[PDB]
Design an enzyme around this catalytic site. Sequence first.
Site, short mmCIF file in Angstrom:
data_model
loop_
_atom_site.label_atom_id
_atom_site.label_comp_id
_atom_site.label_asym_id
_atom_site.label_seq_id
_atom_site.Cartn_x
_atom_site.Cartn_y
_atom_site.Cartn_z
N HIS A 156 0.79 -1.23 0.00
CA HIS A 156 0.00 0.00 0.00
C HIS A 156 0.83 1.28 0.00
CE1 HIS A 156 0.27 0.00 4.54
NE2 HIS A 156 0.09 -1.30 4.37
N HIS A 166 6.20 7.05 5.65
CA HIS A 166 5.76 6.53 4.36
C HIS A 166 5.10 7.69 3.63
CE1 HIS A 166 2.26 6.29 7.00
NE2 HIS A 166 1.58 6.58 5.90
N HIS A 189 1.98 8.95 0.54
CA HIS A 189 0.83 8.72 -0.33
C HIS A 189 1.01 9.63 -1.53
CE1 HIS A 189 -1.27 6.75 3.09
NE2 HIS A 189 -0.56 7.62 3.79
N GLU A 234 -3.48 13.19 1.03
CA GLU A 234 -4.66 12.75 1.77
C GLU A 234 -5.40 13.94 2.35
OE1 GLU A 234 -3.30 9.33 4.21
OE2 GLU A 234 -4.31 8.30 2.54
N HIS A 284 4.03 11.04 5.77
CA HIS A 284 3.55 10.82 7.13
C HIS A 284 4.68 10.26 7.96
CE1 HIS A 284 -0.85 10.46 5.66
NE2 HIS A 284 -0.46 11.71 5.82
N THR A 330 -5.21 6.54 8.35
CA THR A 330 -5.87 6.66 7.05
C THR A 330 -5.85 5.38 6.25
OG1 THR A 330 -3.93 7.35 5.82
CG2 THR A 330 -5.18 9.09 7.00
C1 LIG Z 1 2.85 0.83 12.73
C2 LIG Z 1 1.38 0.95 12.37
C3 LIG Z 1 0.46 0.88 13.59
C4 LIG Z 1 1.05 2.20 11.57
O1 LIG Z 1 1.72 3.15 11.52
N1 LIG Z 1 -0.19 2.15 10.88
C5 LIG Z 1 -0.64 3.28 10.16
N2 LIG Z 1 -1.86 3.11 9.56
N3 LIG Z 1 -2.22 4.45 8.87
C6 LIG Z 1 -1.17 5.30 9.15
S1 LIG Z 1 -1.30 6.94 8.47
N4 LIG Z 1 -1.49 6.78 6.79
O2 LIG Z 1 -2.47 7.57 9.07
O3 LIG Z 1 -0.07 7.63 8.86
S2 LIG Z 1 0.00 4.71 10.00
ZN LIG Z 2 -0.11 7.64 5.75
#
Ligand SMILES: CC(C)C(=O)Nc1nnc(S(N)(=O)=O)s1
Ligand SMILES: [Zn+2]
Length: 257
Positions: free
Chosen positions: A61, A91, A93, A103, A116, A195
């Site tokens: 993803h 990471h 998007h 986002e 993010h 997200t």
């Molecule tokens: C390590 C794990 C719990 C994690 O980080 N999961 C996330 N799931 N969405 C994220 S976001 N796009 O809001 O930053 S991070």
């Molecule tokens: Zn993110």
Amino acid sequence: HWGYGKHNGPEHWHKDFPIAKGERQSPVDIDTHTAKYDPSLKPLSVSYDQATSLRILNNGHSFQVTFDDSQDKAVLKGGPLDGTYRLLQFHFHWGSLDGQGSEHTVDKKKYAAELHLVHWNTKYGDVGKAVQQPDGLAVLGIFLKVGSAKPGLQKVVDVLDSIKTEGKSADFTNFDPRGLLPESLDYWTYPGSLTTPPLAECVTWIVLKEPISVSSEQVLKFRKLNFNGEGEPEELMVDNWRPAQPLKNRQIKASFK
Ligand SMILES: CC(C)C(=O)Nc1nnc(S(N)(=O)=O)s1
Ligand SMILES: [Zn+2]
């Protein structure tokens, strides 16, 4: 499995993750004229000097760079936060074209991408516990626009060919995330969610007002990644963004006038 396609994308996620229709979902549109300046908000404290990056991974993803979070090495504090939040991973998007990919949006404007930096509250001991708490995570969001190159991003871009497909990872030590930050730490903040599934409502969002510029060549390398694993039909990892969700009973606060 969930994804970003017509049959498994954001409009489908609520079936497996009913909180997708919850009261504090992310991302949101940031209406700059309605966000209230909060003079009680403190400056953000970003202490990344001792960050220890470990690996870079294509998870189907996004791609993520992971950090050693077993110690207070790279931490976020201050701003709207109470306590200390450890950096675990960052990471991105991004879009298929420069006019979409972020986002969060700003007065409905979409940026080409959004970074993010995900941190978790040390009072909960580990990230899995933190995700079950309304103040468990703090995600620092940074917009990317296309123009000049971001030199501090190049080391990331140059390794993406080695993690093209889902499941691939590589050593990615000595990466300094300070090279991804804009000059200003002026920010908007609001209570929200992850997200991506499980969409847990555990995040204090801190979205920087100042984008960073990246070059067309840098973002084009993001767009060569694949959602699919090796051997499966090639589907470019593009448009891995969730659209803005209803603000509902929430106020976005600005750290700046
Ligand atoms: C390590 C794990 C719990 C994690 O980080 N999961 C996330 N799931 N969405 C994220 S976001 N796009 O809001 O930053 S991070
Ligand atoms: Zn993110």
